[PDB]
């Protein structure tokens, strides 16, 4: 499945992953493609933060959906 991750600035990126792929690996894919650290990368879907212990199927994420990519608010 492919999701449309919309960056804070408004730039939408397309990520191709599997439903069985955990959010952590999904983050790693973006970490290698775009080069965004998984710890600073905040993915919010429907007002909920995508936990690494879940999958796309767990959140019942439909295909061609719009996701939001936010950056960390605090460092520590």
């Amino acid at each position: 499945m492919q999701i449309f991750v919309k960056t804070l600035t408004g730039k939408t990126i397309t990520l191709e992953v599997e439903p069985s792929d955990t959010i952590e690996n999904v983050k790693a894919k973006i970490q290698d493609k775009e080069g965004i650290p998984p710890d600073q990368q905040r993915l919010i879907f429907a007002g909920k933060q995508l936990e690494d212990g879940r999958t796309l199927s767990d959140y019942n994420i439909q295909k061609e959906s719009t996701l939001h990519l936010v950056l960390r608010l605090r460092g520590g």
Binding site: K6, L8, T9, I44, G47, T66
Partner: protein, 80 residues
């Protein structure tokens, strides 16, 4: 009290300085965040959050766009 900006945008039934269009996941309906030139990014975010009834997680998401706007990352600074 000098936030009488010339460019006022009207959303639904109210005029504000900046009305950012924020999607939730689908195309419709779309949400409009009414930000004022003399308002704090976290305040406006919270104000909108309790207004349209959103989850606290949305706070950082919507506030970041406001923060980055004044921060000028995608503009070229210009804060001082």
């Amino acid at each position: 009290a000098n936030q009488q900006t010339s460019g006022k945008v009207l959303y639904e039934g109210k005029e504000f300085d900046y009305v950012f269009s924020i999607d939730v996941n689908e195309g419709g309906p779309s949400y409009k965040l009414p930000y004022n030139t003399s308002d704090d990014p976290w305040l406006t975010a919270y104000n909108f959050l309790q207004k349209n009834d959103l989850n606290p997680m949305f706070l950082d998401q919507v506030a970041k766009f406001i923060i980055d706007n004044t921060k000028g990352q995608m503009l070229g600074l210009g804060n001082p």
